[PDB]
Enzyme design. Sequence first.
Site, short mmCIF file in Angstrom:
data_model
loop_
_atom_site.label_atom_id
_atom_site.label_comp_id
_atom_site.label_asym_id
_atom_site.label_seq_id
_atom_site.Cartn_x
_atom_site.Cartn_y
_atom_site.Cartn_z
N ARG A 181 22.32 91.87 -10.64
CA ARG A 181 20.93 91.98 -10.20
C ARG A 181 20.47 93.46 -10.25
O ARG A 181 19.44 93.82 -10.85
CB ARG A 181 20.81 91.40 -8.78
CG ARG A 181 20.94 89.86 -8.79
CD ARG A 181 21.31 89.27 -7.43
NE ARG A 181 21.26 87.80 -7.47
CZ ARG A 181 21.72 87.00 -6.49
NH1 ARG A 181 22.25 87.51 -5.38
NH2 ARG A 181 21.69 85.68 -6.65
N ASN A 240 31.21 80.93 0.64
CA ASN A 240 30.92 81.96 1.66
C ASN A 240 31.39 81.58 3.08
O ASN A 240 31.64 80.41 3.36
CB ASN A 240 29.42 82.26 1.72
CG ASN A 240 28.98 83.21 0.61
OD1 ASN A 240 29.71 84.13 0.25
ND2 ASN A 240 27.80 82.99 0.09
N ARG A 291 28.96 81.25 12.56
CA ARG A 291 30.18 81.34 13.35
C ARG A 291 30.53 80.01 13.97
O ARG A 291 31.70 79.60 14.01
CB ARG A 291 30.05 82.39 14.45
CG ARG A 291 30.05 83.82 13.95
CD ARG A 291 30.45 84.79 15.05
NE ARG A 291 30.56 86.16 14.53
CZ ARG A 291 31.39 87.08 15.03
NH1 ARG A 291 32.17 86.78 16.06
NH2 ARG A 291 31.43 88.29 14.48
N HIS A 324 29.09 90.47 0.60
CA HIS A 324 27.84 89.83 0.17
C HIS A 324 26.90 89.46 1.34
O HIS A 324 27.03 88.39 1.93
CB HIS A 324 28.20 88.57 -0.66
CG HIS A 324 27.08 88.01 -1.48
ND1 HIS A 324 26.52 88.69 -2.55
CD2 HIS A 324 26.42 86.83 -1.41
CE1 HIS A 324 25.58 87.95 -3.10
NE2 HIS A 324 25.50 86.81 -2.43
#
Lengths: 323, 323, 323, 323
Positions: A159, A128, A96, A183
Amino acid sequence: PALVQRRKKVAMIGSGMIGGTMGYLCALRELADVVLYDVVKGMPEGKALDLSHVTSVVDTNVSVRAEYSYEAALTGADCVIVTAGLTKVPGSEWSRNDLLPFNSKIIREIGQNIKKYCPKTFIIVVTNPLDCMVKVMCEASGVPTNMICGMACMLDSGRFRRYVADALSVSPRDVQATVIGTHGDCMVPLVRYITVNGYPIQKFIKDGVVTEKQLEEIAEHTKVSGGEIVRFLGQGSAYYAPAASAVAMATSFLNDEKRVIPCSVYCNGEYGLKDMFIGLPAVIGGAGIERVIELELNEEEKKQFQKSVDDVMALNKAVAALQ
Amino acid sequence: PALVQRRKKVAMIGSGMIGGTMGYLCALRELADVVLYDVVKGMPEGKALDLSHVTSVVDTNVSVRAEYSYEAALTGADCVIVTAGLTKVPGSEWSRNDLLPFNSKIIREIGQNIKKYCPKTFIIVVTNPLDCMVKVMCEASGVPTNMICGMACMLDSGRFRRYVADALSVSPRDVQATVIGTHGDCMVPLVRYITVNGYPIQKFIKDGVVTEKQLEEIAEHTKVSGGEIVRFLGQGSAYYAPAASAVAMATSFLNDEKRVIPCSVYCNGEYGLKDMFIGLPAVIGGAGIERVIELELNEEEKKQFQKSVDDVMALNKAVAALQ
Amino acid sequence: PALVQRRKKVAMIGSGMIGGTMGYLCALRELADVVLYDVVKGMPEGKALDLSHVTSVVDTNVSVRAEYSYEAALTGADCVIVTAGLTKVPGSEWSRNDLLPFNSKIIREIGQNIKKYCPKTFIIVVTNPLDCMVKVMCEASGVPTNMICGMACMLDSGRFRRYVADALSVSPRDVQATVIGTHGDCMVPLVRYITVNGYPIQKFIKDGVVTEKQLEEIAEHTKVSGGEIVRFLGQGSAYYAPAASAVAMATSFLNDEKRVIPCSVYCNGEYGLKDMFIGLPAVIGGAGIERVIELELNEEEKKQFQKSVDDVMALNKAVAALQ
Amino acid sequence: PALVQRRKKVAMIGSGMIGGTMGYLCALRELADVVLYDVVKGMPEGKALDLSHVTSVVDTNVSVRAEYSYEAALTGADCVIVTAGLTKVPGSEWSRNDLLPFNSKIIREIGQNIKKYCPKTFIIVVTNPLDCMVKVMCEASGVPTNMICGMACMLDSGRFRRYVADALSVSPRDVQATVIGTHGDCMVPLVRYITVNGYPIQKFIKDGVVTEKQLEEIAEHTKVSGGEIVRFLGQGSAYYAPAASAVAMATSFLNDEKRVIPCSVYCNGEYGLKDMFIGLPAVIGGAGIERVIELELNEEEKKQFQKSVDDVMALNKAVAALQ
């Protein structure tokens, strides 16, 4: 004479491990001309030469070039795949105060340049925190909401499928297993929906092939797979599967394949969500995201998805609160 | 020095349209050396030359040869795909008195020769009536029951998937639709089991994407697809998809892929069936048929499958009654 | 939203053995949507269904459709491959009085329709007599001379390479052997130019690997290869390699590969030829025929090429003399 | 039942950038099961997981595992590709006193273990100084001389071909350009032998397409290509093309393709060389190196090759002088 058929062009904004690996897939399959862009001078040019040499070795012909300016990397790009930015911590805090300001700023700038140089491109974000960054990109680039998505869930689903495939001894081609959500530890691998060539997993449990607990251990393994690789690598994170995932998405767009691939997509009504991107099953074709599939989730699934939602809404507020 | 790695070898017993097309897939993908065999002199040699020329054009290197004796076609074959015999009538009568004696006799002879020259091969039968002929082949060749199967259901399932894929506008890669049973009007396309990347079709019906009636029309279209092509061709029947189907099965065996593919397989207990071959979902790997998958069928599905069963049992009795 | 990336589209004008096989390559490789056209109703529709089923089986997604009108087969075609017309006699007489009037008429009509519906397409003619028909097509269609060529020499060169590859025991990928001229006994396989990965064949002769006589026997075998297959087939002629050849040419255009492929191309100065098409090495890219390569021919080679030339000029006069 | 067809197995002894990239090619093409070995714990396991995930994404099924002991990495390996060891200095000094002792020791140990666990494997050495290390490996492993080679010249030739292909605007598939000798400033790019689909480059010079000086600049660029990438990368060296090169060699062996590929091979008479390995054109098939091609070199070429020779003989003496 004039060029009637030109090769597709894919711009990798970010030439670290994932960007260069995606360029490799393009050279190997003769999928498209490739431009490797990055702010760090050096790596892009060495990788572009190595990649140009690959074309000879595998008998294909695409042009792989390094570019350091937006105008040259972006102009003419049919698809732009963005991996630029800081890498997150496996599975809030430092993100953050350090990750978010830095990455929201760079993604916004990349979008402004996409608006300027390739407004008709198909944008695939990898950077991300994914779902959050895809919204920043959508707002900055101004492209139609069906022309931007984020790669994550196909990797998590890959996966998931690999683990189930090992447990059942079948090719993962024939395991349909999906992860939806965002994610992180918040992702939702849908164990109940697992199918083996369309045959529900419940029967395989009844037949003693695999147990419920085993499937939940696989679901947990899927959630921590990214961090597991980070720890083994010591430096950096996964790149072979993340590259193959993004390129599979780009290929479905470039060839209007209409593949069904879970990815961060724009919602306006599905699952009751509005004006936000989140990981869901979608159809990717020549018109970008052509359908967002709404699954019938049970009580427990809605509860875990809700968690993914709250998480994405909180990060988006934090991004707005920075402007 | 000695040859340490030899190419796989696939023997096409029958070099009509399907046999030559399967040889083409082998040359195109550099899958294996190919032998084209047939009782009719001429076609096999012309097709083998044409196919050898393909290797140059597509830059692969496999040997494609014609052979007219069993010893030369069969010796060293890792896989044998049989299309020899009379072709059936689309979707009993003339088949019992003409097709059955002729084809049961030739399949039995081919099996006796497989026992003699390549007892360790993986046999894929295509010759009709399929399930019946696979049992004749199993008995004549004497190979382990996991090393023989028949190609049909993957073709019928491919048709089923193509129609559903068009109705939903997605790639058929992402439609899992299966047909079980025997190849005729008796086949059972499992509409209830249809999934789009593992997501049940029922939700797509609820969402107005496709209707129940539409799915039943697709199921009916699947059942008459073979005859539809026969009528358009005027002469002969389908061969592109039947060839791709048989070769996909052979590839899963040769490369131990463990793909899940519906095909005529040996049952001993599954679905309550004993000592017979019938079309069901199976896992094909390096040890041949490694698993026969037992689906939970509902009342109506059991009723239609039963019909397929009765049909296969009746033809098998008719075959025994000929000896 | 709007379709941003559409699939390439290839129109097969003629759906006999070569047209359907070319459609198969497109479905197998997901190269392009395919339209199968023909004057004979029936075959095109059965082949298009069979081919649509292939896509499911091999997990690709392209649309294969039959069309019987020019407007529907041609509109939107990025490439048009023509096999329509009577088939010639292996390796003048009946051709001048029956083949020529019939085929020059149909090729002219196909060209007029290409001018009308897809003037920007890349035309690949297969219909014989090749070089003659390519000129009729160029004149009727009115497309730029770099946007039309004929497939023949790549097939003849593929045969040549396969034979040399067997004689040397190497993959034909690594044999560069070329045939120039017109498709008949007049063709010129350039034995002197044969190279093994760029290494001249003369040294292989000096080293006892192959003899001069052996190479001349291979050159003769190449010249009669078409007829040899016709005789073995009993009915019809070669199609697997001719299809792969035409599709390799179409692929180099559609993906701007710039492959070097011998094919019937427009000459204006090269080899001293003007306003005619003849088989020569050319570079095929996104702008069609981008270069016609002029080889230094020796005395004997010029003499045999001259023969090909005279032959093409005589047929062209005979075609003009029909109007 | 018993496994009749097992997958090929390739052991990557060394899991740095080239080893992991080669594992990626195996997973992407479903070429073989892969074992990633290395002395450094961590990287191999993270890369093996990432690679296992790739199989799901691209719908293939091969097993990718990490192993840290020789017995587990080597046992059952059909091919072993070695990249273990220190990396050399681009384009003698520190190499003799640090590189040579360290790498000759590790290669010798790897060979002793290959002799112990997989004596019938096909060994491909990548570790530098290449030709020298291939001899150390041959002596330690004891495998037939046709079953060991070194990868270098295919990479150098791929670079050479890419540059010529750009200069001529053709696909490098159609440029045959070869580099022979040892991997360093001593390498010999054979400019005189360059062919465009078997057509000599001399004519292209006469036609003004490219000049002699331009070809010599390309030859010089080829010689310094490795160092150029090292300088741009800042850390490490090329890996995409070196991986594709080694895997193309391994594939020609595993599938008995008989491709013609320049690589470090065992000489006993060719070019007058005895009991040594050096970079030359060779045929790679199922019996390993099936032919070493002897080119007719002119005066200047012999002089430059001689230089490569002297260089390899000097390093080999230095290696012997260490025992």
